[PDB]
Amino acid sequence: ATQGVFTLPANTRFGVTAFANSSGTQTVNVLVNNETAATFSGQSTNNAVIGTQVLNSGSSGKVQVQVSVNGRPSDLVSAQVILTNELNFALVGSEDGTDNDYNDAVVVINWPLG
Amino acid sequence: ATQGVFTLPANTRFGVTAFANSSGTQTVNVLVNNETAATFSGQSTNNAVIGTQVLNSGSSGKVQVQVSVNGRPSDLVSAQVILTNELNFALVGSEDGTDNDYNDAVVVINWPLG
Amino acid sequence: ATQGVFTLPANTRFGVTAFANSSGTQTVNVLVNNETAATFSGQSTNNAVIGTQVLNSGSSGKVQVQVSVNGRPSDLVSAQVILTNELNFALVGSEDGTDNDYNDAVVVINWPLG
Amino acid sequence: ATQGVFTLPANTRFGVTAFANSSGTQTVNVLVNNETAATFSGQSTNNAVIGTQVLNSGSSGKVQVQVSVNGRPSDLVSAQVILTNELNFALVGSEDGTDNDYNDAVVVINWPLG
Ligand SMILES: OC[C@@]1(O)OC[C@@H](O)[C@@H](O)[C@@H]1O
Ligand SMILES: OC[C@@]1(O)OC[C@@H](O)[C@@H](O)[C@@H]1O
Ligand SMILES: OC[C@@]1(O)OC[C@@H](O)[C@@H](O)[C@@H]1O
Ligand SMILES: OC[C@@]1(O)OC[C@@H](O)[C@@H](O)[C@@H]1O
Ligand SMILES: [Ca+2]
Ligand SMILES: [Ca+2]
Ligand SMILES: [Ca+2]
Ligand SMILES: [Ca+2]
Ligand SMILES: [Ca+2]
Ligand SMILES: [Ca+2]
Ligand SMILES: [Ca+2]
Ligand SMILES: [Ca+2]
Structure with a gap:
């Protein structure tokens, strides 16, 4: 099944943060409405934050996370969890x-x- | 129901990161086996990272997150999600x-x- | 924090199923747009299904689950999880x-x- | 990534329930320690319960869910969620x-x- 794709409410500010735990340099790409909106790159085997940014879901609300190492796409796992019908992860x-x-x-x- | 308490596998390294979205200064305390292991403090209304650290679950595996503003405990919501029976949040x-x-x-x- | 309240997409068919694990008779009430839509009642200490039904989220999409034993509301815990940005629980x-x-x-x- | 595999605490009673929403007859197989422990079969396009049973995780705690239609394995998506560090799904x-x-x-x- 497809992973790394999320439908957020339209025109909503959201945060995206990436951590690294590998010998390989991680390239994290975030697409909004199928167009790149953020790219983080870094290397760490100690969960270092390689990037964090505030983005807007826009008119489509479509957000997709891509991860690759040296140009080869990594296999993804994902899920969305909502707490008290308000807080989303x-x-x-x-x-x-x-x-x-x-x-x-x-x-x-x-x-x-906010 | 109690919130913010998690049982991690014993003697396991884990990461803890906090973001702020409020006018009030957030004080995040992390306890391992009921003893403080990390404290982050910061203020932001733009999801800024006010702290990130690598800790060890220790012999008990008990980890508890506390959050307060100006000494008054905030109301917490929490949950644990496991992906592909390996990746924990x-x-x-x-x-x-x-x-x-x-x-x-x-x-x-x-x-x-790692 | 409030628990047991979920916002589903409007006018969408959904299933609701209840299991019992207690000596007390469980009364599960499901409200749609703040109006009762289903009520299950049963007793079991072996996870028996005390009810299952197909409902429609309606125009508001608001669904709330209430649980009581002998008229006394039980304390609730809840969360929503979405898999492959399609399957909701x-x-x-x-x-x-x-x-x-x-x-x-x-x-x-x-x-x-369906 | 592998899906449908879960590590439960050893020697613990758990419930497993299956619902169907397809024109095809669903065959759900549950393995405990890599050995079949339950098999449900049924057809429904209205979320009917095609099976429910109480099993024991045994010494290994390994539980795997398999789903097939007419002998062809279906593609799976899965996750585990824990509420108040006690209730598992x-x-x-x-x-x-x-x-x-x-x-x-x-x-x-x-x-x-129980
Ligand atoms: O060379 C890449 C890799 O092996 O690096 C060490 C560990 O972080 C691993 O999980 C990761 O797949
Ligand atoms: O004064 C604190 C508070 O009102 O600050 C502005 C927003 O971040 C709110 O959610 C938060 O409760
Ligand atoms: O009398 C009610 C109660 O004690 O019944 C036995 C167990 O199912 C318990 O969890 C439940 O709270
Ligand atoms: O023939 C099988 C199938 O098409 O049946 C109707 C719907 O339940 C579908 O989701 C399912 O894949
Ligand atoms: Ca790694
Ligand atoms: Ca790896
Ligand atoms: Ca806020
Ligand atoms: Ca607030
Ligand atoms: Ca019980
Ligand atoms: Ca109880
Ligand atoms: Ca279907
Ligand atoms: Ca289908």
Whole structure:
């Protein structure tokens, strides 16, 4: 099944933050309405934040997270969780190798903000 | 029901990161085996990261997140989500006022690391 | 924080199913747009299904699950999880006593159907 | 990533329930420690319960849900959610065709029981 794709309410500010846990340099791309809106790149094996930014879901509300290492797309796992019917978390994990820890690049999208 | 308390596998490294979305200064305290292990403090209405750190769950695996503003405990909401039976997210939202956006202090705990 | 309240897409068919795990008779009430739409009642300590039904979210999309034992409201815990940005689960747990297993009445709402 | 596999605490009673939403007959197989423990079969396009049963996670705690239609494995989506660090839900969705509603066979595993 497709992973890393989330439908957010339209024209809503949301945060996107990425963490790295791999020897390989992680390239995290965030698309809004199928067009790039943010790109983070970094390397860490200690969960360092390689990027964080505030974006707007726009008219479509479509947000997609892509993760690659040296140009090769990583396998993604994702889900959205909503607490008290208000607080949203769109979560993404990714695997660039063979150990299957799926934390090589971890991306957290949260809203509402402010 | 109690919120903000999570049982992680023993002696496991995990990451904890906090974001702020409120006029009030957020004080996030993380306890491991009922003893403080990390404290983040900051203010932002734009989802700024007020802290991030790598901790160890220790022998008990008990991790508890506390959030307060000017010494008054905020109301918490939380849940744990596991993807592909490997990637874990312990999520916490908090409300310090009356608008109920529960994002005043948002805390994300993730594991495994590395 | 409020629990047991979910905003579903408008005019959408959804399923609601309740399980019981308590000595007390569980009364599960489901409200759509603040008006009762379904009521299940039963007793079991072996997770028996005390009710299942197909409802429509209607114009408001507001769905609220209430659980009580002998007229006393139980304490609720809840969350919504979305898989592959399509499959939705609105989950509710409830505690009628002191052991805090929160399974006395477990309610699962799922959509889409068909 | 692998889906439909969950690690439950050892020797713990859990419930497993399946719903159907497809023209095709759904065959849901539940394995405990890689050995079949339950099999449900049924057809419905109205979310009918095609099976529910109480099982024990056993010594390994390994539980895997498989779904097939006419012998062809369906594509699975899954996740585990824990509320108030006590109530567990292992969720599975499946797609047997091309519309991607992933509800053709929906499986819910919950614990603790009693
Ligand atoms: O070379 C990449 C890789 O093996 O790096 C070490 C660990 O972070 C792994 O999970 C990751 O797949
Ligand atoms: O004064 C605190 C408060 O009102 O600040 C503005 C918003 O972030 C609110 O959600 C928050 O409760
Ligand atoms: O008398 C009610 C109660 O104690 O019944 C036995 C168990 O199911 C408990 O969790 C429940 O709170
Ligand atoms: O023939 C199988 C199928 O098309 O049946 C009707 C709907 O339930 C669909 O989602 C399902 O994939
Ligand atoms: Ca890896
Ligand atoms: Ca890794
Ligand atoms: Ca607030
Ligand atoms: Ca706020
Ligand atoms: Ca109880
Ligand atoms: Ca009980
Ligand atoms: Ca289908
Ligand atoms: Ca279907």
